[PDB]
């Protein structure tokens, strides 16, 4: 859920 | 079990052994100083295309040198302590392009060696030596074993090549080894400052042999070519060589006439064998220079 992995 | 000599003898006997072996090896050197009284091999004059056996020396350090024009040249001092020949080989016996000789270097303890080489040095007549390096040579320059190689084997105005082992840095990084730019410091570089970064591509799926990456650097036989002689001093058996040379101080180095196309044919004015001080009508000076070197004790230069 945060761009990412896993921002 | 395996042991050493110092243990199975007494303190009153150790100095006896020391002085005895020192006297013995020094007497061997004094006996082999003069080869002409022995049986020398046939001597031949210089010819075009021929070669000369080099020698090996001991680096002391560096020094400055000034020319007549006042410009500077840094210079290494190479010393030759004993540097005796060890053996001779024939072209068809060694199966090589060219005949070969062997030259020894630094005299060391006869105790820290192997039985085979000890027997070899005994039957040869000389003490042991640190390094025994090989010199390619034509047959006309055949030199007998047990012959000392003095510093007069070379002269000023001469070009030369020198081989030796480099400084040992151990396992070093890709940067100091190969000279990569590295990665910046700030701007968010996370644990990547001196890394090599990429290694190869993605489709290649492997790393090419001969790729640059961290490893042991130094401690290898590297050679420098085209150096030049500025001064020879005979009583100390030291020679000057321009610029610099590989290796640490007090290292053994190999020296040979320069092989370059421009510096190959000049071998007529020089002794085709080594320099034999005995038997000559005259004895050379202590030191001798190139004509374009300001000699100490001479007046300061003054142009016009």
């Amino acid at each position: 859920x945060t761009x990412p992995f896993x921002x | 079990s395996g042991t050493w000599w110092d243990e199975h003898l007494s303190e009153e006997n150790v100095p006896f052994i020391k002085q005895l072996v020192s006297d013995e090896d020094k007497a061997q050197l004094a006996s082999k100083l003069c080869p002409l009284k022995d049986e020398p091999w046939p001597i031949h004059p210089w010819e075009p295309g021929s070669f000369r056996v080099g020698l090996i020396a001991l680096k002391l350090g560096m020094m400055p040198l000034w020319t007549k024009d006042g410009q500077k040249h840094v210079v290494t001092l190479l010393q030759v302590q004993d540097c005796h020949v060890l053996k001779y080989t024939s072209k068809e016996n060694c199966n090589g392009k060219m005949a070969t000789l062997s030259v020894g270097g630094k005299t060391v303890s006869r105790f820290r060696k192997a039985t085979s080489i000890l027997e070899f040095y005994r039957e040869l007549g000389l003490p042991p030596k640190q390094t025994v390096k090989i010199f390619n040579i034509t047959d006309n320059a055949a030199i007998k074993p047990g012959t000392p190689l003095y510093a007069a084997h070379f002269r000023p105005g001469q070009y030369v090549d020198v081989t030796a082992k480099t400084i040992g840095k151990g396992f070093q990084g890709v940067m100091k080894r190969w000279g990569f730019k590295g990665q910046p410091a700030t701007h968010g570089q996370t644990k990547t400052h001196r890394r090599p970064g990429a290694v190869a591509t993605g489709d290649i799926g492997r790393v090419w042999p001969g790729t640059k990456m961290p490893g042991k650097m130094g401690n290898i036989y590297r050679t420098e070519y085209g150096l030049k002689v500025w001064r020879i001093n005979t009583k100390h058996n030291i020679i000057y060589v321009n610029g610099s040379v590989p290796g640490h101080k007090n290292c053994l180095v190999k020296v040979k006439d320069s092989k370059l196309p421009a510096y190959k044919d000049l071998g007529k004015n020089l002794p085709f064998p080594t320099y034999f001080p005995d038997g000559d009508e005259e004895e050379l000076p202590e030191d001798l220079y190139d004509e374009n070197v300001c000699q100490p004790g001479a007046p300061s230069i003054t142009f016009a």
Partner: protein, 219 residues
């Protein structure tokens, strides 16, 4: 007696034969060139044979900041401010293109190295070329001028206030604050001078050097 700071070798290890050879060479040169005794903080005038100049000779007077190097490559630094601009030279005292040395004045400063004269006021290094030699008696002690020096504001190059330099000519009581000196004494490392394995005893080798100098001189 007095020995030069370049006959003595460096702490590093090597064969004393190298030192002996370079020593006898520089002494064969000393037989010609006089190198009048001097120290740091002495004012020296030097004449050198330069290939390009009016008469191909170059004169230069300056205060000695330091004597560096060993052997034939030994040098001394000179400094002088002329026309409001500060020049410095590094002279090799065994080069043959130098014609002769002269000591206009012989002094010793509290600081063994005087590189802080860069940041010091120009008037301290302002020495005229036309000043004649201050004749000194042939056998007397060395005059030590116990003085202190004013300096440019803080924007320096070397950060002289630290204690590793162990220098005293500067006047930081005026040049900075009690707080800044207390902050600078942070780096105080007494174990440097209290340690006893790092220093280099010289008596042996300097005695040998005296011996060899006397021998080569009388020979």
């Amino acid at each position: 007696r007095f020995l030069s700071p370049e006959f003595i070798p460096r702490r590093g290890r090597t064969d004393p034969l190298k030192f002996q050879i370079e020593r006898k060479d520089m002494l064969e040169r000393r037989k010609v060139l006089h190198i009048p005794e001097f120290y740091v903080g002495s004012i020296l005038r030097v004449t050198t044979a330069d290939p390009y100049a009016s008469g191909k000779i170059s004169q230069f007077l300056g205060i000695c900041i330091q004597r560096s190097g060993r052997g034939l490559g030994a040098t001394f630094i000179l400094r002088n401010v002329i026309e409001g601009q500060g020049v410095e030279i590094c002279f090799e005292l065994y080069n043959p293109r130098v014609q002769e040395i002269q000591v206009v004045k012989l002094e010793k400063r509290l600081d063994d190295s005087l590189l802080y004269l860069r940041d010091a006021l120009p008037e301290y290094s302002t020495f005229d070329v036309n000043m004649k030699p201050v004749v000194q008696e042939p056998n007397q002690k060395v005059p030590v001028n116990e003085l202190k020096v004013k300096m440019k504001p803080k924007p320096w190059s070397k950060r002289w206030e630290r204690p590793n330099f162990n220098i005293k000519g500067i006047r930081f009581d005026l040049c900075l604050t009690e707080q800044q000196m207390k902050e600078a004494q942070k780096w105080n490392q007494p174990w440097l001078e209290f340690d006893m394995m790092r220093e280099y005893d010289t008596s042996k080798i300097e005695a040998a050097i005296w011996k060899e100098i006397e021998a080569s001189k009388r020979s």
